[PDB]
Amino acid sequence: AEQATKSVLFVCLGNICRSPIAEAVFRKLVTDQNISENWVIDSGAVSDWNVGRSPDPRAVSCLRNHGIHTAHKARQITKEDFATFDYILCMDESNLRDLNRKSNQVKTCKAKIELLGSYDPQKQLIIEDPYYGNDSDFETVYQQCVRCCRAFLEKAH
Numbered sequence: 001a002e003q004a005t006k007s008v009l010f011v012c013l014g015n016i017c018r019s020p021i022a023e024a025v026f027r028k029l030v031t032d033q034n035i036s037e038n039w040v041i042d043s044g045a046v047s048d049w050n051v052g053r054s055p056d057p058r059a060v061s062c063l064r065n066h067g068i069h070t071a072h073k074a075r076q077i078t079k080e081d082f083a084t085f086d087y088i089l090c091m092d093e094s095n096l097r098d099l100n101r102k103s104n105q106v107k108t109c110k111a112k113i114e115l116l117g118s119y120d121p122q123k124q125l126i127i128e129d130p131y132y133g134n135d136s137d138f139e140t141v142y143q144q145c146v147r148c149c150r151a152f153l154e155k156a157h
Contacts (some may be wrong), residue, residue, distance in 0.1 A: 002038070003035060003038045003157075004038070004157070005038055005039070005040065006038065006039055006040075006086050006087075006156060006157070007039070007040040007041070007042075007084065007085045007086045007087070008026065008039065008040075008041055008042075008085060008086065008087040008088075008089060008152075008156075009042050009043065009044055009077070009081055009085040009087070009088050009089070009111070010022035010023045010026070010041075010042075010043040010044075010089050010090070010116065011043065011044055011045065011046060011077060011088055011089070011090040011091070011095055011099060012043075012045060012046070012090065012091045012092075012095060012129075013045060013046050013047055013091075013092075013094070013095060013129060014045055014047060014049055014050045014074070014131065015043055015044055015045030015050060015072075015074040015075065015076075016045075016050045016053060016055050016056045016059065016074055016131075017055070017056050017058070017059050017129065017130050017131050017138070017141070018091045018127055018129070018130070018141055018145075019043035019044065019045070019090075019091065020043050020055040020059055020070055020072045020074075021055075021059050021062065021063060021138070021141055021142055021145050022043065022089070022091075022116060022127075022145045022148075022149065023041055023042065023043040023070070023072060024063050024068050024069075024070040024072070025063075025068065025142070025145045025146055025149050026039075026041055026145075026149045026152075026153070027039075027041050028067075028068050029146075029149050029150060029153055030153065033153070040085075042085075043072060044074075044075050044076060044077040044078075044081065045074055045075065045076050045077065046076075046077065046095055046098045046099070046102075047076065048076045050074040051074050051075055051076055052073055052074060052075075053073065053074045054072070054073060054074075055070060055072060055074075056131070058130075058135060058138050059138055061135070061138075062135070062138040062139060062141075062142050063142070065139075066142065077099070077102065079102075079105075079106045081111070082102070082103050082106045082108065082109040082110065082111050083106070083108040083109065083110055083111075084110070084111075085110070085111045086110065086111060086112065086156075087111060087112050087114065087152075087156065088111040088112070088113045088114070089114055089115070089116040089119075089148075089152065090113065090114070090115060090116060091115070091116060091117075091126070091127040091128075091129070092115075092126050092127065092128065092129070093126065096113065096114075096115060099113050100113060116145070116148045116149075116152070117144065117148055118148075119147075119148040119149075119151040119152040119155065120144065120147050120148045120151065121147060121151055122147060124144055124147075127141055127144050127145070127148075128141075
């Protein structure tokens with residue numbers, strides 16, 4: 001008794017730490033709920049810094065600690081992303097400014113652009129960049145992503 005097909009693009013600065021973790025977490029959630037076939041899921045970066053790279057090894061390891069694997073390779077957000085995804089969910093205030101600016105530069109913007117943390121029941125609005133941190137920072141990002149992803153899934157139609 002089908003749920004309509006929906007799409008989400010997680011966005012961070014580099015697409016190596018936060019948005020690959022958010023994507024993988026969301027993918028695991030929808031697979032646990034047997035509705036993976038009803039979602040199109042991707043991640044992408046504001047910048048072109050890391051294009052082609054697999055996620056930061058700390059992020060891959062964080063995900064493996066929680067039984068999750070990812071085959072993502074970094075890519076930059078494109079004009080076409082704004083036209084094709086239903087939701088673009090980003091990590092911090094800087095990502096939000098940059099995506100709202102990019103969306104102004106395109107003619108077709110279907111995507112609703114939001115902070116992923118706006119979905120957190122625990123009200124942690126910002127998912128802070130762990131790149132210069134340690135494994136515990138990646139774990140904090142993981143746990144934030146779990147909360148936000150879970151809430152988003154139950155609100156999004």
